[PDB]
Amino acid sequence: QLGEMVTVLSIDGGGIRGIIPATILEFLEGQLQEMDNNADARLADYFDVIGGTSTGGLLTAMISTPNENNRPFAAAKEIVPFYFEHGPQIFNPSGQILGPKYDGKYLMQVLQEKLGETRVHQALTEVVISSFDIKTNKPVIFTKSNLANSPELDAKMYDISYSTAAAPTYFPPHYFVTNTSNGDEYEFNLVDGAVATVADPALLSISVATRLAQKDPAFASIRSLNYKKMLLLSLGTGTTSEFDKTYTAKEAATWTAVHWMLVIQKMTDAASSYMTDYYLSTAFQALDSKNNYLRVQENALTGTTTEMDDASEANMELLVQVGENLLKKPVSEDNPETYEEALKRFAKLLSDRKKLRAN
């Protein structure tokens, strides 16, 4: 039964490369608008869970936060323009001797302007936005489902959105406070969700959905790990394996802490993409439901496109092009089905499931 299926969207971290999954989501949301004869159709109307880390978490906030009309704040086609307009200002070097490359002031200001005073409890869907708390030394995952037992986690969307993207050495860590059930203050000292090993948060997102299945009847079909009843769209921001951008053990033997810090996050984020995709492929293949899991990832980033913080006009235009080209790429080797075709199929499933539930 299509009707009882659970739908999950997950978007990887990757700074300015967030243009790639936003281009994919522009295509998908456009397909849903066309099929359902509704120009106001939004991703949040079709997905039960939306997960994201860093810029993927920023995107999650923009498409799940309600406006004045209780409709998603941003259309998927407004995200790439957001990156072109605000990306150069977010990634404007502070030039300060000590501290990170960026002071994070513009990033906080634009998040505050766009999200207002909205809180995670107002999200139009279940959201999964990651961070790591350097004071408690634990991952801090923001969701709606855990607000019943943890009301202190009902933070402001701009606090969550800045925190999930606060990459060490790029932006300063974020501090903010909330209130507990008995009025006590609850503090957060947060850095980017990539530090919590979820630069790819797709497995975390389906785990939150699986936990919800134990208490929420709308998620009941996936209780007992029946991922045959789950539809998962996982979007990457690309990786690189071309020798011009990678390293040898020989040259790295004399590297100091400064050189290792510049590359350690790119390596762990690539690893999170490969490892999470491996866990998920294993799970969906074990239930003979491989085609329920669509991973849209760019495997060969080249030139300036590898850098997380290059918000030059030329690099952002190259990122739109890698996204548009990714649509025409095959889903795998030996399978001529393109990403565009698999996304049209996914769109149709999302539309049919929404229709069946309305009956």
Residue numbers in the entry: 24 to 382
Quote the original article.
Patatin is a soluble 40 kDa non-specific plant lipase that is expressed extensively in the tubers of potatoes and other members of the nightshade family. Previously, the crystal structure of a recombinant patatin isoform, patatin-17 (pat17), derived from the tubers of heartleaf nightshade (Solanum cardiophyllum), has shown this protein to have a modified α/β hydrolase fold containing a central 6-stranded β-sheet sandwiched by 9 α-helices along with a catalytic center composed of a Ser77-Asp215 dyad. This fold and active site configuration is reminiscent of the human cytosolic phospholipase A2 family of enzymes, but it is distinct from the traditional Ser-His-Asp/Glu catalytic triads found in serine proteases and esterases such as chymotrypsin and acetylcholinesterase (AChE), respectively. Recently, interest in patatin and its homologues has been heightened by the discovery that a diverse group of mammalian lipases, termed the patatin-like phospholipase domain containing proteins (PNPLAs), encompass catalytic domains with sequence similarity to patatin.
Overall, our structure of native (non-derivatized) pat17 is similar to the SeMet-derivatized structure described previously by Rydel et al. (RMSD  = 0.27 Å). Pat17 purified and crystallized as a monomer in the asymmetric unit. In agreement with results presented by Rydel et al., pat17 consists of 8 β-strands and 9 α-helices arranged in a modified α/β hydrolase fold with a central 6-stranded β-sheet consisting of five parallel and one anti-parallel β-strands sandwiched by 2 α-helices in the front and 7 α-helices in the back. The catalytic Ser77 is located on a loop between β2 and α2 (termed the nucleophilic elbow) that contains the classic G-X-S-X-G lipase consensus sequence motif. Ser77 lies adjacent to Asp215 creating a catalytic dyad defined by Rydel et al.. In contrast, the catalytic dyad of pat17 functions with Asp215 acting as the general base that activates the catalytic Ser77 residue. The catalytic dyad of pat17 sits at the bottom of a large chamber (153.6 Å3 calculated using VOIDOO) lined with the following residues: Gly36, Gly37, Gly38, Ile39, Ser77, Thr78, Leu81, Phe105, Tyr106, Gly110, Phe114, Phe194, and Asp215. Two portals were found to flank helix 7 (α7) with the first portal (portal) being 16 Å in length and lined with the following residues: Ala190, Pro191, Ala 217, Val218, Gln288, Thr291 and Asp292. The second portal (portal) is 15.2 Å in length and is lined with the following residues: Arg40, Gly261, Thr262, Lys289, Asp292, Ala293, Gln320, Leu324, Thr329 and Met331. Comparison of the DFP-aged structure of pat17 and the MAFP-inhibited structure to the native pat17 structure yielded Cα backbone RMSD values of 0.19 Å (DFP- aged vs. native) and 0.12 Å (MAFP-inhibited vs. native).
